């Protein structure tokens, strides 16, 4: 769309100006049930060839149901919250006796509904499959005859269509032990996920966003396994809500900034230890240090606010002017000189130092730029690859406009050797 950036050469850093946040701020719980009936012994004579697969398939179904019966850089300053919280709370509400009977009775014919519980929680109900009708009309009248024999094999293959889903649920919850990250399409088909998008109490622009990013909400959703009792087997999806949508959110890339002293090891240097995402949420900014938590999709970031900081709104002031008497402007410092390079959305920041080859090269003209010393920058729409030392990188060829500002060697404003070199977290 309108991706832009401003690599400051004062401190080696990239700001990803222009994005829309679409941040989760809460969970919306929903219960999903599959109805199912208890099957007794086979009550059949012989083994045959037509009526044989029914026996192994019903034994597999029995194994599944009895198995599920048996079933039941600022990360150091980053807060920790139990993400699997509301769903296990809803399961715990379901553990009370006579409560899941309300779901059983109230969701008798309607596919989706909303019921009230004994804790005032009235989230949602939904049934995913109807093994009542199929089991008690198309399987058990046939398999439980005198000297049983199926009419045709076409009966049992659709039984595959009505049992591989349940077996997928069983094998998903058996491996990941109740909690699944993310939610598989077997726990919710995608068209039904869209139906659920059209169900929860959100405003319609959130509905459009979640519809256009069903893969994102599928990736961030969790699943917790609730009870099995009175054979109304059900679980809870803890699919993400989305509180604040469409605010500018920038990605701060950072790079080493080391003076080019020929004497090795005596070149103290520093970076902004502020790599991550900053979204302007409410009268503050949500800061995400762990870049792996945040996801990106076509100008739309998606990052869960449980692992964030409610940092004050005065952060662009330090972002532009590093030397301000308003923000702490946190610093990583060390005398270690490492040749390295990072990739922003619209180019690459090279920070090779000392005896190290530094090249930006593209497949059209071969090599196109050589960096002598100091951190430098290359726009993405002039080059495909960047080589530093003995390693290569490919830049994002996504279209966007770049502007490279003139900066200055900030670390050379101070004395060459008075700096400490023994801290990860610091500030100016």
């Amino acid at each position, epitope marked *: 769309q309108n991706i832009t950036e401003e690599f400051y050469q004062s401190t080696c850093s990239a700001v990803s100006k222009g994005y829309l946040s679409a941040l989760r701020t809460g969970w919306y719980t929903s219960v999903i049930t599959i109805e199912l009936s*208890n*099957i007794k012994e086979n009550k059949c004579n012989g083994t045959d060839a037509k009526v044989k697969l029914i026996k192994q398939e019903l034994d597999k179904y029995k194994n599944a149901v009895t198995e599920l019966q048996l079933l039941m850089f600022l990360g150091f300053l980053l807060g920790v919250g139990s993400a699997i919280a509301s769903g296990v709370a809803v399961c715990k509400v379901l553990h009370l006796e006579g409560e899941v009977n309300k779901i059983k009775s109230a969701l*008798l014919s309607t596919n989706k509904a909303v019921v009230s519980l004994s804790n005032g929680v009235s989230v949602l109900t939904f049934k995913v499959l109807d093994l009542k009708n199929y089991i008690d009309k198309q399987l*058990l009248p046939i398999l*439980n*005859k005198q000297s049983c024999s199926i009419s045709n094999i076409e009966t049992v293959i659709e039984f595959q269509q009505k049992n591989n889903r349940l077996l997928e649920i069983t094998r998903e919850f058996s491996v990941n032990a109740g909690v699944t990250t993310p939610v598989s399409t077997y726990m919710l088909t995608n068209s039904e996920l869209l139906s659920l998008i059209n169900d929860m109490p959100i405003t319609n622009d959130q509905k459009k966003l979640m519809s256009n990013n069903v893969q994102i909400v599928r990736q961030q959703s969790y699943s917790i396994m609730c009870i099995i009792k*009175e054979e109304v087997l059900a679980y809870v999806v803890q699919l993400p809500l989305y509180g604040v949508i469409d605010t500018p959110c920038w990605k701060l890339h950072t790079s080493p900034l080391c003076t080019t002293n020929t004497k090795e090891g005596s070149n103290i240097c520093l970076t902004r230890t502020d790599r991550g995402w900053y979204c302007d949420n409410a009268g503050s900014v949500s800061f995400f240090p762990q870049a792996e938590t945040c996801k990106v999709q076509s100008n739309r970031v998606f990052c869960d606010t449980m692992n964030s900081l409610t940092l004050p709104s005065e952060v662009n002031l330090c972002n532009v002017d590093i030397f301000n008497p308003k923000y702490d402007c946190k610093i990583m410092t060390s005398k270690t000189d490492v040749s390295s390079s990072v990739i922003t959305s619209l180019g690459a920041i090279v920070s090779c130092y000392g005896k190290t080859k530094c090249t930006a090269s593209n497949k059209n003209r071969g090599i196109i730029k050589t960096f002598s010393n100091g951190c430098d920058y290359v726009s993405n729409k002039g080059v495909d690859t960047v080589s530093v030392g003995n390693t290569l990188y490919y830049v994002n060829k996504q279209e966007g406009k770049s502007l490279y500002v003139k900066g200055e060697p900030i670390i050379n404003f101070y004395d060459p050797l008075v700096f400490p070199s023994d801290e990860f977290d610091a500030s100016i």
Partner: antibody
Amino acid sequence: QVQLVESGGGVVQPGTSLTLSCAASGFTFRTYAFHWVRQAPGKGLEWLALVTYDGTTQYYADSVKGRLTIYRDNSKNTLFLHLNSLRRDDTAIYFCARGGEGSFSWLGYLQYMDVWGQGTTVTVSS
Amino acid sequence: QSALTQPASVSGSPGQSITLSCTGTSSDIGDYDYVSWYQKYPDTAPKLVIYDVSERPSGVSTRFSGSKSGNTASLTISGLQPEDEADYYCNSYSSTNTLKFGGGTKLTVL
């Protein structure tokens, strides 16, 4: 103590939809299931309807479907039917009965007639 | 209403054997291993005398004997009694999700 006693019935106008109730005491109720049947003077027994534990998969005979609805409560464990559009032919004695053992919703396991009621007499005339 | 054909009444002295039967279709007392026979005295609740083709319940004599042959359920007695004057029915799960009943056979003695 195993028993089935009845509630409701009597002389009814044509139309004037009837609510009929079971009652049982001395045993568990939710574990098994209740169901409804009749027999009329001049003929024998005729099946009507069944429920499982709680309200699920309300079985209806082809001759009884539509007019009759059936539902069980878990509060004091008495099956309730409501039959509508009463004709001249429904004069009969209606019996509760119990069936089913485990957590089953299948009619094959729901066919044991382990206990019967005394039935309500429903008579229609003018 | 659809039901099971049965004799109206049978004439037999005490001490002899009656073989009261009903006949249905394939989607009836035929197959499914659900043949049941029930007897009832006037103004008394019906009681289980035969379930599961040949299985006999508790609290009843073994002189009753239920069986089936194709689409025909049968109940046989031995050593008839004056107390056996009752009406009988065959109930079984018909596979169109119903419990089909019998027409009633009256066992009497003279």
